[PDB]
Symmetry: C2
Subunit: 205 residues, 2 copies
């Protein structure tokens, strides 16, 4: 069964960028719920239950028809937020191979950020914006609700190994930014953990 | 050209059920934005810009994929919220023809409320919960993002004429309820304008 992962920090660690009140609720309420609903659905699926959530979401089509939707939403939700927590930290600097790779595939860090911001801002409704690695090339893609590029094109409309990502569901930014999602996206640049992204990139490049 | 309609009441007229701060932000920011993005899209579509928003959304299939998407989301947003504002009011009582029709298609008002609450709660991500009239039968359905049953089955995955509806995007309840969407849904019963719902049921158009 899945468990709510402990965070790499206290809820107020991303202040004054991401509000601690949201961090706590996002963690203990929203993320906990994805874990509970996922476990409920996995109760009658012993073989699928052993898999780490990241591997499960890559096999949604092998699940019984009546299990696909509930797990797609909740396993996706568990996997996305687990990655999200580790993908946040103050004081990091984009550098090394990840910086060079971005400049290589996007032309420059600026083209990258502008493209990411647009993807993040144009995602209508609930969803995520991602920086993924497709084989040997990085790209910016977005998914609806709790879908993940790890689920593949057929299901999520996107694909690739997620290096980093931004949650754009309104619950991730409403208490502090309300409708102003663009300001929330700007703040994200102050808390995206480039060291973790660099770590994931070194493992997959 | 569409315009942001004025509310039938003050921002605090729905309290202590729906908070005034949300009422204002939801109206002057969210709805206002759908109106603006919708007009920008219709600015290069004269043959369509003169149609009432409710009618435009039934003809989305007559638009190129690009305009279709932007209008589906924003014309839909404009139509749904214009209906929402008029569909809210305190001190009304479910009665007469509409109440008899509900008990008839659902068994009783409580059975109806329970089915509506389930539909509203189960709508994963952003979307709406509706009470629609399909021919001569009432039904409960939900749509994603700003989709409307007026768009037809193929586009929204639902159909029928909207009688009443509840917006379950998180921006509609996060400031006061945060993650507790169910408490928000329960409060809805105190502000749903049954007089206007009864009027729409009588007109059937
Ligand atoms: Fe989230
Ligand atoms: Fe809304
Ligand atoms: O989310
Ligand atoms: O809205
Ligand atoms: O909405």
């Amino acid at each position: 069964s899945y468990t709510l992962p402990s965070l790499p920090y206290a809820y107020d660690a991303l202040e004054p960028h991401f509000d601690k009140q949201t961090m706590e609720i996002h963690h203990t309420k929203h993320h906990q719920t994805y874990v509970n609903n996922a476990n409920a659905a996995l109760e009658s699926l012993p073989e699928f239950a052993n898999l780490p959530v990241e591997e499960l979401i890559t096999k949604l089509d092998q699940l019984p028809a009546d299990k696909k939707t509930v797990l797609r939403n909740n396993a996706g939700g568990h996997a996305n937020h687990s990655l999200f927590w580790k993908g946040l930290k103050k004081g990091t600097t984009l550098q090394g191979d990840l910086k060079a790779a971005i400049e290589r595939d996007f032309g420059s860090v600026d083209n990258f950020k502008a493209e990411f911001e647009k993807a993040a801002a144009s995602r209508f409704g609930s969803g995520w914006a991602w920086l993924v690695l497709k084989g040997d090339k990085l790209a910016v893609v977005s998914t609806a609700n709790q879908d993940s590029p790890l689920m593949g094109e057929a299901i999520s409309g996107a694909s690739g190994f997620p290096i980093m990502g931004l949650d754009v569901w309104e619950h991730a930014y409403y208490l502090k930014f309300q409708n102003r999602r663009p300001d929330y996206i700007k703040e994200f640049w102050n808390v995206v953990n480039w060291d973790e992204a660099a770590a994931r990139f070194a493992a997959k490049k």
